[PDB]
Amino acid sequence: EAYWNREQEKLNRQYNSHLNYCEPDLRVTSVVTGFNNLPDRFKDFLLYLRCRNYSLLIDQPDKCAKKPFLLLAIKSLTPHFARRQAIRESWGQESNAGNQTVVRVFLLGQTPPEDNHPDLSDMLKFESEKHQDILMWNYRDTFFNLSLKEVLFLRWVSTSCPDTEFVFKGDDDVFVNTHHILNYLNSLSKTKAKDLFIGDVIHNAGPHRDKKLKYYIPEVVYSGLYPPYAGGGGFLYSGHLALRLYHITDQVHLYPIDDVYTGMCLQKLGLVPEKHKGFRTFDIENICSYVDLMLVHSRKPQEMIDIWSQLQS
């Protein structure tokens, strides 16, 4: 009865246009109960659900010219200049130690004037030319379009970085202990590494029905429970799985919560992401508190540099 569930079931029957239909899908105004009274973000989500063929405005095509051991992929918005630079100087440094290459990309969409964003296009061009780590696509960068940010990033992995051994995807305000991540990745068996997917995995979750939370999903949009999913603050997976995940995205309708969407894709593949206790996407309760952690949400740019500096000793 909920809209997403019914359309997804239609998709299941077709695989057992929803991909490049980019006119407004006016059907939703008649088939979604109370559509006129939905918040604008749901109107936009429903009207443009069947469009995901957006193009790269800023690419870094040689980012993976040397096959990486680890790709860091960080969700960011144009105005977050200090967040990105703190990451570059702390846990997101690119490196080649042990010939285990780490490369870094930030994942951006457009911040257009119609959404009341200041025009930062000249600063973003300066930054992209200076640091060569900005990927930017021509879609409206919004909270409910983070699942678009996920799908287009996975597409970019498939086209431009398909041979990375591992992928870390996360937020631009989480602290990551990249040394611990690399140590963990190097201790993996070959079998465990082929389909690795770990994070702060949430089981038996359901959609928030509370209208004051940013995660609110109306009953007319989605019914039932969520699959197991790793919290989007940051998760870690094999590049092999990144390609299998990209292939399966066509068979899963976009969903307004992006980390739930990745969990939906894993489930369709027959996989279950595994919890690693070092991923603290809901923060901690002292620099020694951070020694054994993989990730902590959330930290400001100065805090990111401070923690990283103290951890090096």
Ligand X SMILES: *[C@@H]1O[C@H](CO)[C@@H](O[C@@H]2O[C@H](CO)[C@@H](O[C@@H]3O[C@H](CO)[C@@H](O)[C@H](O[C@H]4O[C@H](CO)[C@@H](O)[C@H](O)[C@@H]4O)[C@@H]3O)[C@H](O)[C@H]2NC(C)=O)[C@H](O)[C@H]1NC(C)=O
Ligand Y SMILES: CC(=O)N[C@H]1[C@H](O[C@@H]2[C@@H](O)[C@H](O)O[C@H](CO)[C@@H]2O)O[C@H](CO)[C@@H](O[C@@H]2O[C@H](CO)[C@H](O)[C@H](O)[C@H]2O)[C@@H]1O
Ligand Z SMILES: *[C@@H]1O[C@H](CO)[C@@H](O)[C@H](O)[C@H]1NC(C)=O
Q: Give the interface with ligand UDP as residue ranges (CB under 6 A).
A: 75-77, 80, 141-143, 146, 171-173
The CA-atom distances, in angstroms, between 166 and each of 3, 8, 35, 131 are 35, 30, 42, 22
| Tokens 């359309």 found at | 7
Please provide the size of the chain in residues: 313
Draw the binding track, 48-87, toward ligand X (x: CB under 6 A; -: no contact): x--x------------------------------------
State the nearest-atom distance from the C-beta of 191 to ligand UDP, in Å. Answer: 32
Contact 84, 127 (CB under 8 A): yes
61 part of the interface to a copy of itself, by CB under 8 A: no
- In degrees to the nearest 10, what's the CA dihedral of 122, 128, 130, 131? 150
| The pair of three-digit structure tokens given for residue 116, joined into one six-digit string | 């009341």
54 part of the interface to ligand Z, by CB under 6 A: yes
- CA Rg value for the chain: 19
Q: Which residues ranging from 55 to 84 are in contact with ligand Z (CB under 6 A)?
A: 66-67
The CA-atom distances, in angstroms, between 226 and each of 101, 182, 222, 236, 263 are 35, 30, 10, 20, 8
Give 77 or 103: the residue with its C-beta nearer to ligand UDP: 77
Give 3 or 54: the residue with its C-beta nearer to ligand Z: 54
Given 101, 147, 164, 262, the residue binding ligand Z (CB under 6 A): 101
Strands 197-199 and 274-275: parallel
Given 1, 13, 16, 20, the residue binding ligand Z (CB under 6 A): 20
172 part of the interface to ligand Y, by CB under 6 A: no
Q: Which residues have a Cβ under 8 Å from the Cβ of 91 and sit 6 or more positions away?
A: 175, 176, 177, 178, 304, 308
Q: Which amino acid is at 294?
A: M
- H or E segment at 155? helix 146-160
259 part of the interface to ligand Y, by CB under 6 A: yes
Specify the 3-state DSSP secondary structure of 36: helix
Candidates 50-58, 124-132, 176-184, 276-284: pick the segment binding ligand Z (CB under 6 A). Answer: 50-58
State the nearest-atom distance from the C-beta of 288 to ligand Y, in Å. Answer: 26
Burial of 148 (0-12, 13-18, 19+ CB in 10 A): buried
State the nearest-atom distance from the C-beta of 186 to ligand Y, in Å. Answer: 28
State the nearest-atom distance from the C-beta of 118 to a copy of itself, in Å. Answer: 4
Binding site for a copy of itself (CB under 8 A): 78-79, 81-82, 85-86, 88-89, 115-120, 122-123, 126-127, 130, 301-303, 305-306, 309
Q: Which residues bind ligand Y (CB under 6 A)?
A: 202, 204-205, 207-208, 215, 231-232, 257, 259-260, 281
Please report, as ranges, the residues that interact with ligand Z according to CB under 6 A: 20, 22, 51, 53-54, 66-67, 99, 101
Residues that bind ligand X (CB under 6 A): 22, 24, 41, 44-45, 48, 51, 139-140, 142, 144-145, 148
